[PDB]
Design an enzyme around this catalytic site. Structure first.
Site, PDB file in Angstrom:
ATOM      1  N   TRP A   4       0.741  -1.248   0.000  1.00 25.24           N
ATOM      2  CA  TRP A   4       0.000   0.000   0.000  1.00 25.24           C
ATOM      3  C   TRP A   4       0.781   1.315   0.000  1.00 25.24           C
ATOM      4  O   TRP A   4       1.844   1.444   0.634  1.00 25.24           O
ATOM      5  CB  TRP A   4      -0.930  -0.008   1.197  1.00 25.24           C
ATOM      6  CG  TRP A   4      -1.804   1.157   1.249  1.00 25.24           C
ATOM      7  CD1 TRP A   4      -3.047   1.274   0.695  1.00 25.24           C
ATOM      8  CD2 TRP A   4      -1.511   2.413   1.859  1.00 25.24           C
ATOM      9  NE1 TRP A   4      -3.545   2.522   0.924  1.00 25.24           N
ATOM     10  CE2 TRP A   4      -2.621   3.250   1.635  1.00 25.24           C
ATOM     11  CE3 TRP A   4      -0.412   2.917   2.571  1.00 25.24           C
ATOM     12  CZ2 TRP A   4      -2.671   4.583   2.101  1.00 25.24           C
ATOM     13  CZ3 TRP A   4      -0.459   4.254   3.039  1.00 25.24           C
ATOM     14  CH2 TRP A   4      -1.580   5.062   2.797  1.00 25.24           C
ATOM     15  N   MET A  23     -17.186   5.061  -0.619  1.00 21.23           N
ATOM     16  CA  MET A  23     -16.259   3.936  -0.559  1.00 21.23           C
ATOM     17  C   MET A  23     -16.911   2.785   0.200  1.00 21.23           C
ATOM     18  O   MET A  23     -17.565   3.006   1.210  1.00 21.23           O
ATOM     19  CB  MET A  23     -14.967   4.344   0.153  1.00 21.23           C
ATOM     20  CG  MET A  23     -13.895   3.258   0.142  1.00 21.23           C
ATOM     21  SD  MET A  23     -12.435   3.605   1.178  1.00 21.23           S
ATOM     22  CE  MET A  23     -11.346   4.467   0.027  1.00 21.23           C
ATOM     23  N   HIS A  77     -13.994  -1.768   4.468  1.00 22.08           N
ATOM     24  CA  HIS A  77     -13.256  -3.027   4.575  1.00 22.08           C
ATOM     25  C   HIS A  77     -12.193  -2.929   5.674  1.00 22.08           C
ATOM     26  O   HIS A  77     -11.818  -1.825   6.072  1.00 22.08           O
ATOM     27  CB  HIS A  77     -12.568  -3.284   3.237  1.00 22.08           C
ATOM     28  CG  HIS A  77     -11.987  -2.042   2.629  1.00 22.08           C
ATOM     29  ND1 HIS A  77     -10.877  -1.407   3.149  1.00 22.08           N
ATOM     30  CD2 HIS A  77     -12.413  -1.270   1.600  1.00 22.08           C
ATOM     31  CE1 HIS A  77     -10.647  -0.299   2.468  1.00 22.08           C
ATOM     32  NE2 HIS A  77     -11.566  -0.192   1.521  1.00 22.08           N
ATOM     33  N   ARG A 136      -8.243  -3.758   7.335  1.00 24.56           N
ATOM     34  CA  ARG A 136      -6.857  -3.803   6.856  1.00 24.56           C
ATOM     35  C   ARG A 136      -6.582  -5.095   6.067  1.00 24.56           C
ATOM     36  O   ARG A 136      -7.007  -6.189   6.461  1.00 24.56           O
ATOM     37  CB  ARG A 136      -5.876  -3.676   8.037  1.00 24.56           C
ATOM     38  CG  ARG A 136      -4.396  -3.990   7.720  1.00 24.56           C
ATOM     39  CD  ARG A 136      -3.753  -3.048   6.676  1.00 24.56           C
ATOM     40  NE  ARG A 136      -3.557  -1.663   7.132  1.00 24.56           N
ATOM     41  CZ  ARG A 136      -2.523  -1.218   7.854  1.00 24.56           C
ATOM     42  NH1 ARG A 136      -1.552  -2.040   8.236  1.00 24.56           N
ATOM     43  NH2 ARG A 136      -2.451   0.069   8.188  1.00 24.56           N
TER      44      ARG A 136
HETATM   45  O1  BGC Z   1      -5.032   7.427   1.334  1.00 22.24           O
HETATM   46  C1  BGC Z   1      -4.672   8.609   0.668  1.00 22.24           C
HETATM   47  C2  BGC Z   1      -3.344   8.629  -0.078  1.00 22.24           C
HETATM   48  O2  BGC Z   1      -2.519   8.854   1.150  1.00 22.24           O
HETATM   49  C3  BGC Z   1      -1.114   8.968   0.870  1.00 22.24           C
HETATM   50  O3  BGC Z   1      -0.334   9.330   2.021  1.00 22.24           O
HETATM   51  C4  BGC Z   1      -0.546   7.766   0.089  1.00 22.24           C
HETATM   52  O4  BGC Z   1       0.838   7.912  -0.258  1.00 22.24           O
HETATM   53  C5  BGC Z   1      -1.347   7.522  -1.165  1.00 22.24           C
HETATM   54  O5  BGC Z   1      -0.976   6.269  -1.756  1.00 22.24           O
HETATM   55  C6  BGC Z   1      -2.817   7.331  -0.744  1.00 22.24           C
HETATM   56  O6  BGC Z   1      -3.610   7.109  -1.874  1.00 22.24           O
END
Ligand code: BGC
Ligand code: CA
Lengths: 123, 272
Positions: B184, B214, B217, B219
Site C-alpha cells: 500500500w 467507498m 473493509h 486492513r
Molecule cells: O489514502 C490517501 C493517499 O494517502 C497517501 O499518504 C498515500 O501515499 C497515497 O498512496 C494514498 O492514496
C-alpha cells in the site's frame, strides 16, 4: 481515532516552530505518516511504528516485542496509541532534537511545496 | 448515426448509493440487457468519441465488484460511453501491486478494441453523481475528488488516487505507471509526479459533482504500508523512464469473459 487535520493541528500547536518545523509542515507530514490515526500500527522490517507520529520501538519507545529497546523517549509504546498527544509530542520533540525531521520520510517528498493547503483556519 | 451530445440527456445528477441490499449479478445482467459478453457497451442512438476501457485492479473482492457493477453499468450507459470493463486479478499472495495491475489492464484492453481513453478505478469507489463523467479530458482527470473516507474532500492537492482517467496519449506520455511499488501507498503519488514532469496539470470536477462513496473493509494483510514508498516517490523523475509500460512483464493465467466484465488473472511476479 482518525483525527481531522484541524484536530491534529490544534492538538500539536505546542510543537509549532520547534526545531524550525511549522504546523503546516507537520499537518502535511502527519497525514502521510499515519492518516491522522492515533492508533496507527505499522510494521517496518522487524520494527514497529506507533501512532500519529509513527514513533518506532527500534530506538524510541518500549514495546513488549522489543523490551530491550533503547527507549530514548522513556515511554511505553502503547502510550502512543491513544488520543492523548502530550506524550507523543514530547517524544517527537526528542526525535527532532536528536535525529531531526528526516526521521519522517514523508517530509521531503510530500511536504516541500504547497504548504498553504495544510493550514487549519478553525479556531 | 450522429455524434452523442457533449453532455448526455440521460443524466440524473445525484444518486443514493447504498451497500445493504445484496445484489445478484444475474439481476444486474437482467437490468443491463444492452451490455454484451465481456462487459462491453456501445450506444445505439449515437456515436460516442469516448472509447473507454475501465481498468479495475483486483484480488479477492468479488463482493465489492458486485456493487461496483451494479452501480456503474447503468451510470456509464447514461453517460453514453463506448466502454468495456476489465478486472485485473492479481494471482498469488505477494503484496498487492495496484499500479502494475493497471499497466496490465492498459495493454490487455488494447488487444480488444482501439480504446482512446483509460479509466483506472479501485473496486470500492462508486460515484454519487452521474455528471462526474467516466471519460478522458484534455488533461489527466482525477475523478474521485470528494470521497466519504476523507469527509467528502480532497485529502491533499497532489492526490491522484482512487479513480482517474488518462487518454491513451497522456498514459503513453509518462511511460505508463510504475511497476516497482508493492504493498500500500505512494504509487498514485508517483503517477502524479510523472504527470507533473511531463508538464500536465490535473483536471477535476468540483467537490459536489465529484462525491464518491467507498465500500468499507478491514486492513488487508496482503497490502501492508510500503516502507520504501517515500524514497520511491522522491525519485520518480529518474525512475519513470526505466520503470513503466516499457518494462512491463507478466503472465496471463486466464482471460474470463463474463456477461458483465472481462476478468484477466495474471502473474505479475514478486518484489525484487
Ligand atoms: O489514502 C490517501 C493517499 O494517502 C497517501 O499518504 C498515500 O501515499 C497515497 O498512496 C494514498 O492514496
Ligand atoms: Ca498518547
Amino acid at each position: 481515532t482518525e483525527l481531522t487535520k484541524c484536530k491534529v493541528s490544534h492538538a500539536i500547536k505546542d510543537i509549532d516552530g520547534y526545531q524550525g518545523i511549522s504546523l503546516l509542515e507537520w499537518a502535511c507530514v502527519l497525514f502521510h505518516t499515519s492518516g491522522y490515526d492515533t492508533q496507527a500500527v505499522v510494521n517496518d522490517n522487524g520494527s514497529t511504528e506507533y501512532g500519529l507520529f509513527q514513533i518506532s520501538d527500534r530506538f524510541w519507545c518500549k514495546s513488549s516485542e522489543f523490551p530491550e529497546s533503547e527507549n530514548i523517549c522513556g515511554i511505553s509504546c502503547d502510550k502512543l496509541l491513544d488520543d492523548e498527544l502530550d506524550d507523543d509530542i514530547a517524544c517527537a520533540k526528542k526525535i527532532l532534537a536528536i535525529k531531526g525531521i528526516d526521521y519522517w520520510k514523508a517530509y521531503k517528498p510530500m511536504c516541500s511545496e504547497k504548504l498553504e493547503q495544510w493550514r487549519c483556519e478553525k479556531p | 448515426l450522429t455524434a452523442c451530445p457533449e453532455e448526455s440527456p440521460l443524466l440524473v445528477g445525484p444518486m443514493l448509493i447504498e451497500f445493504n441490499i445484496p445484489v445478484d449479478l444475474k439481476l444486474v445482467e437482467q437490468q443491463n440487457p444492452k451490455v454484451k459478453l465481456g462487459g462491453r457497451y456501445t450506444p445505439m442512438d449515437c456515436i460516442s468519441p469516448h472509447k473507454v476501457a475501465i481498468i479495475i485492479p483486483f484480488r479477492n473482492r468479488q463482493e465489492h465488484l458486485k456493487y461496483w457493477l451494479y452501480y456503474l453499468h447503468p451510470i456509464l450507459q447514461r453517460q453514453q460511453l463506448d466502454y468495456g470493463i476489465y478486472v485485473i486479478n492479481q494471482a498469488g499472495e505477494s503484496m498487492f501491486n495496484r499500479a502494475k495491475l493497471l499497466n496490465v489492464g492498459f495493454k490487455e484492453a488494447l488487444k480488444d478494441y482501439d480504446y482512446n481513453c483509460f479509466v483506472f478505478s479501485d473496486v470500492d469507489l462508486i460515484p454519487m453523481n452521474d455528471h462526474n463523467t467516466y471519460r478522458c479530458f484534455s488533461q489527466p482527470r482525477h475523478i474521485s475528488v470528494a470521497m466519504d473516507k476523507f469527509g467528502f474532500s480532497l485529502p491533499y492537492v497532489q492526490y491522484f488516487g482512487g479513480v482517474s482517467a488518462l487518454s491513451k496519449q497522456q498514459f503513453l506520455s509518462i511511460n505508463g505507471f510504475p511497476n516497482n511499488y508493492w504493498g500500500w501507498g505512494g504509487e498514485d503519488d508517483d503517477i502524479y509526479n510523472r504527470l507533473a514532469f511531463r508538464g500536465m496539470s490535473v483536471s477535476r470536477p468540483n467537490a459536489v459533482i465529484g462525491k464518491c462513496r467507498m465500500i468499507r473493509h478491514s486492513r488487508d494483510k496482503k497490502n501492508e504500508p510500503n516502507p520504501q514508498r517515500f524514497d520511491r516517490i522522491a525519485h520518480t523523475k529518474e525512475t519513470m523512464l526505466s520503470d513503466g509500460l516499457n518494462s512491463l512483464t507478466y503472465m496471463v493465467l486466464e482471460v474470463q469473459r463474463y456477461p458483465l466484465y472481462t476478468k484477466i488473472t495474471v502473474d505479475i511476479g514478486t518484489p525484487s
